[PDB]
Amino acid sequence: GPRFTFFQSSRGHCQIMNILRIYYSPSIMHRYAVVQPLHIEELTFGAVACLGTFSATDGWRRSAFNYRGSSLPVVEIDSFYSNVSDWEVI
Amino acid sequence: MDLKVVVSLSSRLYTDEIAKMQQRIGCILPLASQNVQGLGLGQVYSLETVPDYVSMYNYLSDCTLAVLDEVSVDSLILTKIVPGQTYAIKNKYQPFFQWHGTGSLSVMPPVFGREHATVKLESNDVDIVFPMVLPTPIAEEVLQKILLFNVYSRVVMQAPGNADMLDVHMHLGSVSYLGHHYELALPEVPGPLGLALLDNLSLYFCIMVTLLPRASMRLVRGLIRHEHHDLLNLFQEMVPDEIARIDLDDLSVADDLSRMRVMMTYLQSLASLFNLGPRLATAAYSQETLTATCWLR
Amino acid sequence: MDLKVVVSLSSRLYTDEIAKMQQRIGCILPLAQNVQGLGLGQVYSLETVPDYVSMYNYLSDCTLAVLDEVSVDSLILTKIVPGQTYAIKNKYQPFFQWHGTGSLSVMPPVFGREHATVKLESNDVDIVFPMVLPTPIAEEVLQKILLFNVYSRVVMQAPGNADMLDVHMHLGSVSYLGHHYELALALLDNLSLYFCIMVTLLPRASMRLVRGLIRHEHHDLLNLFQEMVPDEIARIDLDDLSVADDLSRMRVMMTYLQSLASLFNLGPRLATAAYSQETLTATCWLR
Amino acid sequence: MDVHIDNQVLSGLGTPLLVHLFVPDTVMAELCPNRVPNAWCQTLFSDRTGLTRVCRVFAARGMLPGRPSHRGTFTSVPVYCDEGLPELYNPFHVAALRFYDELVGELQIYYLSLFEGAKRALLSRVPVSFSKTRRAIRESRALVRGIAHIFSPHALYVVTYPELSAQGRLHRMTAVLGAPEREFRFLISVALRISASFREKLAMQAWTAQQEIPVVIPTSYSRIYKNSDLIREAFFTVQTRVSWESCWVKATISNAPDACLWIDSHPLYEEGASAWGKVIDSRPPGGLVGAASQLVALGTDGHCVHLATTSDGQAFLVLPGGFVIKGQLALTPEERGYILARHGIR
């Protein structure tokens, strides 16, 4: 089943995808061993976009977003400068 | 908002180099965040390493650039690059490039030789080489030329009867400009990161060769069998065997749409790969005094 | 901060230019100021064929600007900074869509020459706006006109292998988010020329690069899993050809994929935030 | 098991048939020490010498066999020789490989040593690599067998397994001398004509040293070397058992890449297989003074006889003691073209 994930990066926007492929390569080595695409789609494996920037002077401080059921830790981003860019496939 | 970031040296800058740093005023230098080392490109491009122009490309693209405007002894003032401000940049680089095109600007590693961008600093244990500033079409042409050279010089070295080593160094060779041809600096081994870039490029290539729109094959066959175009000069009235053997099937339209869909998405991904290195949008480069208002795109 | 740029008209107008500019008071327009070098009237000129890729490069070259108000002698417009925001309305010859759409394109008008072109007889500038249209709409339209030009030129080439009805049922119709729009028709001839010579040199280039990069790494799991991918017939002929013409074909391959790579990026990528449907305007900022 | 499916799909242009191999790590240690290489196929003939087209072969080291009896690298031998029908075999037939990472070391292999071991062993779509599908299911021990290698008296391991009609027509193939003979006698012919050039150059001159290279020499040089003691110049011709590592042909292939030199070094009287074909530079800014320093260090090697070949058609012999005997190089361009085709491309 598909998934959404998040990436903090201190590098620039354009160079970040090539390092993401290097990180992401064991997730793509498991594909295509058991499946082979017909009806041709599926050659794309995920896509990345920019959410924006934030200040690295104050780092992310983990806090506790709790429901009444259980506990759930969360990464807090303070002084975020939001900028939605376009989808870039891998 | 602040732009003024002062950087101290650590020892007395000698008066022989204050003259040339007076000569290099308004140039661009890569930052580290202060300190003295790495404020420049000597730490990743030294004499010891073969210049791969890709790891230093990684460092200049990954780090925010900086303008050097004032040099004094034991203190020199820098100015960062933050998007939204229209920086004044002077083209002060010995391989000259007039910005008659007035296009978008591009920064590149010193591929035009070590001497043209270096400066010796006998005060401390730091030497500075400078990033090259050059327009968009020359930058992308020299980029594809240095990648094609580091991928084909190695296979020419792989040839046992390598009768022609100097064939690519004079055909590929210099750079394409109407004013002059300007010979560049050429590595012999591509380095690791260069082969990583060719690896991802060949990955995109072998993914995109699995889908070709078959109608276009018929068009280039018909135009070859029409008059030979000036754009068709690279064929010199010849049909390659491969396009003759991938046209055994007929012309369809159903697979053509999804073919073109994945081709748009992978060409935009390839453009995102080749829009690498920080870019400048130019408004009104003034010709008579060699200065340009530019902001970070 | 005042980003407003007045364009001084040479000749006095009359009421039709008023009615057409107030018909077109929302749409955007390029720049260099001067009245002549104002719009796409230096590239949509009828003294030549109005080409596509040079039009794209000229539009990406100069900055963009929105028109605000028209007087008898002045043409009040405001240009675009990537710092602050602006407003944008459609007021276009096709009234397609602004469906909350997080990305927007500015394409040159490929539907019709005079569909955007407000033609003025008092001054022969024949100003013409680029089409503002959202991004999947723009990609689908560019796909469906590129393949339309390939199919038209191949049925002009040989009328045996191509027809027109089964592609009019297929690629004359654009559809997006419950809206079904219609589009039909030598600039696209040059574009399809670039596209066809790209895909023609692509097998030789791809097989040369994979034979170059095939065994650098001596055991990678990714390398094998990407080299079992390609066509088994796309991997025969390299050493029959020499080095010089092959590398020239590589050079023209690379510069053409770079040019078309920026071209299949959708040009000046505007971005919308909140579209008010009852007002027909969107809040925009350059990105 | 990667390089076999690598070269199998690759060499379909210039080869109909492809044979897969192992190479142990002991059998090429005398070829190139310190694991300096990491190829190129050119199978010359036995009596139909001529010249043939070249084929590239890919390979890998450091990846271990499924046999733990020995642990070595991967190679593979293409076979494309037999005209029309491939059912005939050429017996007593060399097949040269140029294993390399940057052209050092050669690999001579037989068709008998290959095939006797081979018999002894036995909305659209993406298409799959077809030939890799049958190698994963084999995974067995009987596919690899031990072959007494003929050039070096060791074991060379082959791999083959019942793939398909190409390897199926291989194990039925048989058919009804001089493939190692011609290259050695060709070396002795060019060595005899060069020694004859030295003979006639010492004859037309006064039989005297010009001493082109400067060395100081002791007064007992006519004692610790005896009178007319050219017994090393005598048995020079037997000692050159190698040629394409030897500098003599290295100058002829260097014509395609002006002030260059290649030096062979043979010891004073059988100290061992010293070296063949080293480099004297003039291109980089080490310069002609560095060339002169390396040259006088060559000349002061008191227990090694050096032979110097130029690119422009001249041969030189260096006696230990700084004495130089001039000589010519002029050979018929048929042998020149045969040599540069034997290495690579004209």
UniProtKB/Swiss-Prot annotation, chain A:
Location in or out of the cell: Virion; Host nucleus
Domain of life: Viruses
Listed transmembrane segments: none
UniProt family annotation: Belongs to the herpesviridae TRX1 protein family.
Function comment: Structural component of the T=16 icosahedral capsid. The capsid is composed of pentamers and hexamers of major capsid protein/MCP, which are linked together by heterotrimers called triplexes. These triplexes are formed by a single molecule of triplex protein 1/TRX1 and two copies of triplex protein 2/TRX2. Additionally, TRX1 is required for efficient transport of TRX2 to the nucleus, which is the site of capsid assembly.
Subunit structure of this chain's protein: Interacts with TRX2, MCP and capsid vertex component 2/CVC2.
Protein name per UniProt: Triplex capsid protein 1
Swiss-Prot record, chain B:
Keywords: Capsid protein, Host nucleus, Virion
GO molecular function: structural molecule activity
Cellular localization per UniProt: Virion; Host nucleus
Record's subunit section: Interacts with TRX1 and major capisd protein/MCP.
Annotated family: Belongs to the herpesviridae TRX2 protein family.
Highest taxon in the source lineage: Viruses
One matching Pfam family: Herpes_V23
Organism lineage: Viruses, Duplodnaviria, Heunggongvirae, Peploviricota, Herviviricetes
Assigned GO CC terms: host cell nucleus; viral capsid
Keyword field contains Electron transport: no
Function: Structural component of the T=16 icosahedral capsid. The capsid is composed of pentamers and hexamers of major capsid protein/MCP, which are linked together by heterotrimers called triplexes. These triplexes are formed by a single molecule of triplex protein 1/TRX1 and two copies of triplex protein 2/TRX2. Additionally, TRX1 is required for efficient transport of TRX2 to the nucleus, which is the site of capsid assembly.
Protein name listed in UniProt: Triplex capsid protein 2
InterPro entries per UniProt: Herpes_capsid_2 (IPR002690)
Chief location: virion
Swiss-Prot record, chain C:
Organism: Epstein-Barr virus (strain B95-8)
Cellular component terms per the entry's GO annotation: host cell nucleus; viral capsid
Highest taxon in the source lineage: Viruses
Entry's family note: Belongs to the herpesviridae TRX2 protein family.
Keyword entries, A-Z: Capsid protein, Host nucleus, Virion
Chief location bin: virion
GO MF term set: structural molecule activity
Name the UniProt record assigns to this protein: Triplex capsid protein 2
Subunit structure and binding partners: Interacts with TRX1 and major capisd protein/MCP.
InterPro entries, per the entry: Herpes_capsid_2
Curated annotation (Swiss-Prot), chain D:
Gene Ontology biological process terms in this record: chromosome organization
Localization of this protein: Virion; Host nucleus
InterPro entries: UL17-like
Protein name listed in UniProt: Capsid vertex component 1
One cellular component term from this protein's GO annotations in UniProt: host cell nucleus
Entry annotated with the keyword Membrane: no
Pfam families cross-referenced by the UniProt entry: Herpes_UL17 (PF04559)
Function comment: Capsid vertex-specific component that plays a role during viral DNA encapsidation, assuring correct genome cleavage and presumably stabilizing capsids that contain full-length viral genomes.
Ubl conjugation listed as a keyword: no
Transmembrane segments: none
The entry's keywords: Capsid protein, Host nucleus, Late protein, Viral genome packaging, Viral release from host cell, Virion
Organism: Epstein-Barr virus (strain B95-8) (HHV-4)
Predominant location category: virion
Subunit structure: Interacts (via C-terminus) with capsid vertex component 2/CVC2.
